[PDB]
Amino acid sequence: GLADFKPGVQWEICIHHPIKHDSAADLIPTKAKVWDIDMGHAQEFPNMIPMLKSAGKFVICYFNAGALQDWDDDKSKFPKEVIGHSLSYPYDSEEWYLDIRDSRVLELQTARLDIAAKIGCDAVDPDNVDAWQQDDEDPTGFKLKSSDYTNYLKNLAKYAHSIKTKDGQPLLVGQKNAPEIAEDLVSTLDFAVLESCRGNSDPNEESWPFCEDFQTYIDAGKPVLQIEYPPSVEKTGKVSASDNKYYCTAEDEDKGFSKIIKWASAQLDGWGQYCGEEPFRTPAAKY
């Protein structure tokens, strides 16, 4: 339902493992109408998106727009010159920021958009578009400006908005975080996916709240898909009473967002919780 794809829509995100999809009954939680899944997992399990579509779901395909990963099928096509610092620089890792000004990166990323369109995705959720140099600290090594990310996302959107999905409509493109450029992108992009817009319940964490910067998407009739990671979950397996107050108590700044509680940014698995409800778990497919 593209009709359903509007502010307030219920959703689930599960990118750490493939979702189970033998039947519609596997698609826990059943009230989620929007499903954000890893584009690779959808290719590895070819009946996944068909199953989602048969159950009436709108499908968002996650991919990594701003960083290259050691396991990417297309990794060998990226020149060394566009590969920057490890996401744990100075330590080597399996993930490295890309020079998203570069035409070669754009070409490779648009080929991924072609795949998203071919396999049945209604939309894409492009990651890591927030790594410009800030306060004399440079995440990528390329000394990127916030406007470089605005331009890149506009280029991704221009491409996606020129190709059709399997349901016969333009491919949609989300904004992932990057609150500073929401006002510059809201006309172009189709929705937002946020992590920790409410900040952090540990006030000593550097985590300035930014939910208010995405009200402009709600104003445009575009959903804001809001992920919160209460610290207590990763530590204890449960949302503490104090974390429930911090993340779930009604506030103007995230009014109208589609809020979900998840385990950790590095563990966006099937576990989840809606405010005012017990947790659920989307089951995993087996390799």
Residue numbers in the entry: 31 to 317
The authors write:
Endo-galactosaminidases are an underexplored family of enzymes involved in the degradation of galactosaminogalactan (GAG) and other galactosamine-containing cationic exopolysaccharides produced by fungi and bacteria. Whereas the fungal enzyme belongs to family GH114, the two bacterial enzymes do not lie in the current GH families but instead define a new family, GH191. The TIM-barrel core structure with fully conserved active-site residues and a negatively charged substrate crevice is conserved among all the families.
Similarly, within the GH114 family, F. solani GH114 overlaps with Ega3 (AfGH114) with an r.m.s.d. of 1.49 Å over 218 residues, with a sequence identity of 35%. Thus, overall the crevice of FsGH114 is deeper and more pronounced compared with the bacterial GH191 enzymes, but also with Ega3. In both cases up to seven subsites could be identified.
